Structure formats: C-alpha cells, structure tokens
Design an enzyme around this catalytic site. Structure first.
Site, PDB file in Angstrom:
ATOM      1  N   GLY A 186       0.773  -1.221   0.000  1.00 25.45           N
ATOM      2  CA  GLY A 186       0.000   0.000   0.000  1.00 25.45           C
ATOM      3  C   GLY A 186       0.801   1.265   0.000  1.00 25.45           C
ATOM      4  O   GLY A 186       0.237   2.314  -0.344  1.00 25.45           O
ATOM      5  N   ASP A 187       2.069   1.198   0.385  1.00 28.27           N
ATOM      6  CA  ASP A 187       2.974   2.354   0.348  1.00 28.27           C
ATOM      7  C   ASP A 187       4.398   1.811   0.176  1.00 28.27           C
ATOM      8  O   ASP A 187       5.265   1.962   1.042  1.00 28.27           O
ATOM      9  CB  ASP A 187       2.842   3.208   1.589  1.00 28.27           C
ATOM     10  CG  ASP A 187       3.735   4.414   1.588  1.00 28.27           C
ATOM     11  OD1 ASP A 187       4.102   4.870   0.495  1.00 28.27           O
ATOM     12  OD2 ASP A 187       4.058   4.916   2.690  1.00 28.27           O
ATOM     13  N   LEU A 188       4.628   1.190  -0.970  1.00 28.65           N
ATOM     14  CA  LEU A 188       5.859   0.353  -1.177  1.00 28.65           C
ATOM     15  C   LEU A 188       6.996   1.229  -1.698  1.00 28.65           C
ATOM     16  O   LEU A 188       7.635   0.912  -2.711  1.00 28.65           O
ATOM     17  CB  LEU A 188       5.581  -0.850  -2.014  1.00 28.65           C
ATOM     18  CG  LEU A 188       6.693  -1.933  -1.958  1.00 28.65           C
ATOM     19  CD1 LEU A 188       6.755  -2.575  -0.563  1.00 28.65           C
ATOM     20  CD2 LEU A 188       6.457  -2.982  -3.020  1.00 28.65           C
ATOM     21  N   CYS A 189       7.289   2.317  -0.981  1.00 30.78           N
ATOM     22  CA  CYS A 189       8.511   3.056  -1.206  1.00 30.78           C
ATOM     23  C   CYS A 189       9.645   2.366  -0.480  1.00 30.78           C
ATOM     24  O   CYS A 189       9.443   1.674   0.545  1.00 30.78           O
ATOM     25  CB  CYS A 189       8.336   4.461  -0.721  1.00 30.78           C
ATOM     26  SG  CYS A 189       7.757   4.690   0.896  1.00 30.78           S
ATOM     27  N   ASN A 192      10.070   1.644   3.398  1.00 29.04           N
ATOM     28  CA  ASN A 192       9.155   0.695   4.048  1.00 29.04           C
ATOM     29  C   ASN A 192       9.552  -0.751   3.870  1.00 29.04           C
ATOM     30  O   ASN A 192       8.818  -1.662   4.304  1.00 29.04           O
ATOM     31  CB  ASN A 192       7.721   1.004   3.679  1.00 29.04           C
ATOM     32  CG  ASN A 192       7.292   2.334   4.178  1.00 29.04           C
ATOM     33  OD1 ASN A 192       7.814   2.825   5.197  1.00 29.04           O
ATOM     34  ND2 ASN A 192       6.277   2.923   3.561  1.00 29.04           N
TER      35      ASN A 192
END
Length: 270
Positions: A186-189, A192
């Site tokens: 969901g926030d795969l920067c 993370n």
C-alpha cells in the site's frame, strides 16, 4: 503542532521508563524506544480510525506468513491513540547504497511476490482505486497536496489540474485492477522495506497502514521510482533495473499503468 505531551502520556502510561523519543506529519508522530526495539505511532482524536485500521493490518499480516511488525499495544484517550509495534530490525532500503540495493533487488522481488500471492478475496482490507481516487479528490479539494511529494516536473502545477489528467482513466484502470488484483503493501517506497544488513535479504515490511487489495502497480510504481533515486548516474543499470525486477517477480511491464499510480499516489496524502 504535534501533540507531544498528550502522546508521550499515552506511551508512558505503563511506567516502563522506555525513553520514548520522536523520530518523525498531519498531526501524527512516530516515536522509538531508547533501546530501539519498539516503535509507536500516535495520532490525534480525529485520525484514530486510520490508526486502528493500521493496527488491524499489522495484526492480520502477522497471521499471513509475511514478515512485518507485531502489535505490542493499543492505547486510547481523549487526545487520540497510540499504536506500539515491534521494530523490524535491519536497514531501511532507502539507506542502502546502490550496490547494497542491487544485492537486495531479487530478494525484494521475491518478498513482494509472496505478499502479492496472498489470496486477494480473503484479504479483509482494500486500497482499491475507487477509494484512493476519492481520497485524492478530497486532498485536492482541501488544497492539502504537499508539492514536495510530486514528481519534480509537476511541482509547479495546480494539483486540481494534475488530478484532472488522471480522472478520465479511472474506468480503464479499474478494469486492469479487477483483472490483476493483489494484496498490496500500500505504500511500497524503499523506506518501508527493511533489509537484513548481513544477507541483504528482506527482513520485513513496515508502515502497513494502506495494506489491501489493489492493482500490483500501486506498489511497483513506488518501489521503482524510489529505487531510481538510488541508481543515480548509473545509466546502464537504471535502464535495465525494472525489466529485471519484472522478470524475477513475474509480470509484464505496463508503463502507462505504472505512471498512473506514480502520479496518483502523491495526491492521496494529507
């Protein structure tokens, strides 16, 4: 202003003398214990449902054989809530050198593939495009977009105009999402994804508050864009990195679809 005193009251409530200190947004704050072994995220009263949502995602993922934090406590009072979790030990992937990220590149593909192989219809959680597009409409309506999150070339463009570039494609992108949905981080920067500092395998994922069903490019767009910052002046590798990730993970590259999610994501924060 961050409600430091109210948040530290929640964190101090058990009397552990843990030496909670802030480490890093819209009233939410992240703290770490002095020994480094526990993290806490606290939010004001009006954000508690989003933090409870995160709690539930972390706890559920702990039952799915995907490496991530454990929920250690959940604390609530008049001034908001605190979510205490275990540290995922290791080095955040944004802090890796280019050679280190390269060592982790296939391991990342494999770990992301495993997450993206959870059966999506069994996931309790969603971050599907209709929800995310609705979130962007709200951020844009509130004039709350942080231009620092945008691609450099967009930073001087009104965010309502940026949103309007994407709006006509919602239907097409919804059809792609329906055809190829996965359980996304969901926030795969890069920040993370935590790497084991000795093997350079993936130690685990953190910051799971957006976990849920979505098109896999909701994740891959952010991973690829943030890794491009690490590849830097290495043009031979930067021109090949994504194709080799895709081959290892097992997907055909779709640049328009990727770019759509790259461009949507910053509009959804705030």
């Amino acid at each position: 202003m961050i409600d430091l005193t109210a948040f530290l009251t929640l964190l101090r409530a058990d009397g552990g003398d843990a030496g909670w200190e802030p480490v890093t947004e819209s009233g939410a704050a992240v703290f770490r214990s002095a020994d480094g072994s526990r993290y806490a995220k606290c939010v004001p009263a009006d954000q508690v449902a989003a933090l409870e949502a995160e709690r539930d995602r972390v706890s559920w993922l702990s039952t799915q054989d995907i490496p991530g934090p454990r929920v250690l406590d959940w604390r609530v009072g008049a001034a908001g809530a605190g979510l205490l979790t275990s540290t995922v030990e290791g080095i955040p992937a944004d802090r890796a050198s280019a050679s280190m990220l390269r060592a982790a590149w296939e391991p990342i593909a494999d770990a992301v593939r495993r997450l993206h192989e959870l059966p999506p219809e069994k996931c309790p959680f969603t971050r599907e495009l209709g929800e995310m597009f609705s979130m962007a409409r709200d951020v844009v309506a509130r004039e709350a977009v942080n231009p620092d999150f945008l691609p450099e070339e967009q930073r001087h463009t009104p965010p309502g105009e940026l949103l309007a570039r994407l709006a006509p494609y919602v239907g097409q992108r919804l059809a792609q999402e329906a055809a190829q949905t996965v359980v996304c981080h969901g926030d795969l920067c890069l920040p993370n994804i935590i790497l084991d500092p000795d093997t350079l395998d993936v130690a685990g994922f953190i910051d799971l508050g957006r976990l849920g069903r979505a098109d896999p490019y909701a994740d891959l767009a952010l991973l690829f864009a943030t890794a491009r910052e690490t590849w830097g002046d290495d043009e031979r590798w930067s021109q090949s990195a994504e194709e080799e990730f895709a081959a290892r993970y097992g997907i055909a590259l779709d640049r328009d679809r990727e770019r759509f999610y790259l461009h949507l994501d910053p509009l959804t924060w705030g």
